[PDB]
Amino acid sequence: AGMHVVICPWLAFGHLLPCLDLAQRLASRGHRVSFVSTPRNISRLPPVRPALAPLVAFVALPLPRVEGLPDGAESTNDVPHDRPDMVELHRRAFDGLAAPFSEFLGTACADWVIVDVFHHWAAAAALEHKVPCAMMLLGSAHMIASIADMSLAERFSLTLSRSSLVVGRSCVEFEPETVPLLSTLRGKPITFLGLMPPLHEGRREDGEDATVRWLDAQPAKSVVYVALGSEVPLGVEKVHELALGLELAGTRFLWALRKPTGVSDADLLPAGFEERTRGRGVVATRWVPQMSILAHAAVGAFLTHCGWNSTIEGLMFGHPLIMLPIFGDQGPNARLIEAKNAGLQVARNDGDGSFDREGVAAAIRAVAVEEESSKVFQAKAKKLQEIVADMACHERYIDGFIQQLRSY
């Protein structure tokens, strides 16, 4: 019997985009999915695959106006990094979705609600409407174990209290040391839905892209690919530390650079940085074919944030990770990849809790430059690729997850 699944992700593209993938994996089995978000966030998502058009419905709830929160500032991506006051206003707008969400669910005939840790009010609405609620923790088993071992912490606690089930993004193949030791998170059952590696997007025609024609000219495993994504909660000064770290370490690099919100193109990069790195380094601020780039023989390492989604994209192509300390909650996921010898976290300075050019260069030296250490990182990441890129294994975990939703 097909189910109606309501999915309400956190208002961050790093949460929305994996949830849109999950929505399509569930729809692929004949489940009706309601993807609930705000209009400008929905308008900015990629289109659903045509095959899933009748099965995935976008439900747009308007964010209420909050004085100080710009019109159209619907995602964390839209709030300048330097403004914790506007971060709080965005949360106050998000919590205004409680009544419209409850009104929607009242008539949705939903079988499940699936929400992020932020959604204390959505879990309350699920209880009010007697719909079981799954709380997403789409990270490693190690991250869930580390958790087991209004403030964001108060919000998390209240959503977990009000949920039926916790959902992780791993499997016993990837974490055989942890998954078998887990049953519950503070008395709530844990289900793992696999690694859900992204569906292959690479196309023959990507070979024409100037970035790939540049990679074609470079030695095998010589290029550090850098991609922090659209979000980048970094001040311009940390973009500069990253730039100078890439420069000082001396490797070839291809940097898919999306500006932090509010930063001018004039201020984005250190003076003379592009001039000094011409030929060894390419900065691309436009769209790039990322999956064709990660499949390229020239790419030897992936420099990204600590985020689990990016870790999985890198390991799907057998690249060791250089992980910038950008997202606090992502610590355990990066510490797991370091424990597997498949990557290195860039040093976090006990000052700003952030990185400098010296830590970036040191990480690149160890993962990409030194002969002995880079060989070990490459071999460990290639070994992990066998598990991450096993697409049928991960589809069976989606079926297992659906069975757990039914069973409950």
Side-chain angles (χ1 to χ4, degrees):
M3 291 178 290
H4 184 197
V5 178
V6 171
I7 306 169
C8 193
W10 173 235
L11 304 187
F13 279 90
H15 283 76
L16 292 159
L17 292 165
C19 281
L20 180 57
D21 193 7
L22 176 55
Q24 291 183 88
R25 306 294 176 112
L26 299 173
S28 288
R29 279 77 171 170
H31 303 291
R32 291 148 290 124
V33 180
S34 289
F35 189 103
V36 180
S37 197
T38 64
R40 196 196 179 196
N41 287 338
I42 287 158
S43 76
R44 288 182 289 181
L45 296 167
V48 295
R49 297 206 312 294
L52 304 168
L55 291 152
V56 180
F58 289 96
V59 178
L61 309 176
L63 267 191
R65 172 159 181 271
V66 175
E67 295 175 327
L69 183 60
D71 184 53
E74 293 193 2
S75 67
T76 58
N77 301 64
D78 300 314
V79 182
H81 187 58
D82 53 352
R83 297 298 301 270
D85 55 334
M86 301 175 61
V87 170
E88 164 64 21
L89 297 181
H90 174 263
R91 284 199 289 265
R92 290 174 28 187
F94 171 77
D95 288 350
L97 293 178
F101 180 81
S102 177
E103 194 181 340
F104 165 74
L105 193 66
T107 59
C109 305
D111 293 303
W112 274 91
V113 172
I114 309 185
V115 303
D116 271 316
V117 295
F118 293 83
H119 290 70
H120 65 277
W121 43 261
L127 287 167
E128 170 200 358
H129 292 298
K130 300 189 153 55
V131 184
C133 180
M135 194 186 75
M136 291 179 284
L137 281 180
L138 297 189
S140 67
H142 177 63
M143 181 191 83
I144 297 176
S146 300
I147 295 165
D149 202 69
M150 192 171 292
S151 79
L152 292 172
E154 293 174 316
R155 199 178 270 279
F156 173 95
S157 302
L158 195 55
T159 305
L160 176 67
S161 283
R162 289 167 181 179
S163 294
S164 306
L165 174 73
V166 175
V167 189
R169 188 175 175 190
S170 194
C171 55
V172 62
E173 289 83 342
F174 199 67
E175 291 179 82
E177 68 278 359
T178 299
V179 171
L181 306 180
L182 295 182
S183 46
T184 66
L185 173 56
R186 298 181 179 164
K188 298 300 179 169
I190 299 153
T191 185
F192 286 98
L193 55 59
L195 290 170
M196 200 179 74
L199 302 188
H200 289 284
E201 299 181 349
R203 287 151 39 174
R204 184 71 54 193
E205 54 262 36
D206 293 343
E208 207 53 41
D209 190 283
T211 61
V212 167
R213 285 184 299 106
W214 185 80
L215 291 169
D216 287 343
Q218 313 310 319
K221 305 305 188 158
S222 73
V223 176
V224 176
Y225 179 58
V226 189
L228 306 185
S230 48
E231 318 193 92
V232 192
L234 287 188
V236 63
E237 66 286 332
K238 295 303 180 180
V239 178
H240 286 213
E241 286 313 307
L242 176 48
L244 296 174
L246 281 158
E247 186 183 12
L248 291 175
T251 77
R252 294 170 183 78
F253 65 85
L254 173 57
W255 185 2
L257 177 50
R258 300 297 194 171
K259 285 157 45 138
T261 302
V263 179
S264 165
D265 277 0
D267 300 328
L268 184 57
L269 290 173
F273 163 76
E274 290 196 83
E275 232 186 313
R276 291 192 305 266
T277 59
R278 293 257 163 277
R280 90 184 179 256
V282 170
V283 180
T285 57
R286 70 201 159 75
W287 177 92
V288 304
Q290 174 153 307
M291 298 207 50
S292 288
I293 287 160
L294 295 167
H296 200 287
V299 173
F302 182 35
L303 198 170
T304 191
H305 49 67
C306 288
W308 192 234
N309 192 83
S310 302
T311 279
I312 289 165
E313 290 198 46
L315 289 181
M316 191 180 143
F317 289 103
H319 299 304
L321 296 172
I322 305 161
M323 293 171 289
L324 279 185
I326 285 184
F327 296 111
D329 61 320
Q330 284 303 322
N333 292 322
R335 285 198 291 280
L336 176 63
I337 298 306
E338 251 201 66
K340 293 192 176 302
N341 306 118
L344 198 52
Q345 305 163 266
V346 173
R348 208 168 187 129
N349 289 321
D350 281 297
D352 55 0
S354 185
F355 62 86
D356 60 29
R357 66 192 79 169
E358 298 98 352
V360 171
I364 297 162
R365 185 170 341 110
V367 174
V369 174
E370 300 311 320
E371 185 177 37
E372 284 83 343
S373 64
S374 69
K375 187 164 173 292
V376 167
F377 281 114
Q378 275 174 34
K380 296 278 190 211
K382 225 62 177 50
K383 178 64 190 180
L384 295 192
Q385 172 180 32
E386 299 185 5
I387 297 153
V388 176
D390 189 345
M391 309 305 282
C393 172
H394 297 303
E395 279 303 352
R396 293 192 194 88
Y397 271 102
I398 300 295
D399 290 306
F401 177 58
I402 291 168
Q403 174 50 230
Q404 291 308 111
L405 291 188
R406 283 228 183 76
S407 166
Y408 199 117

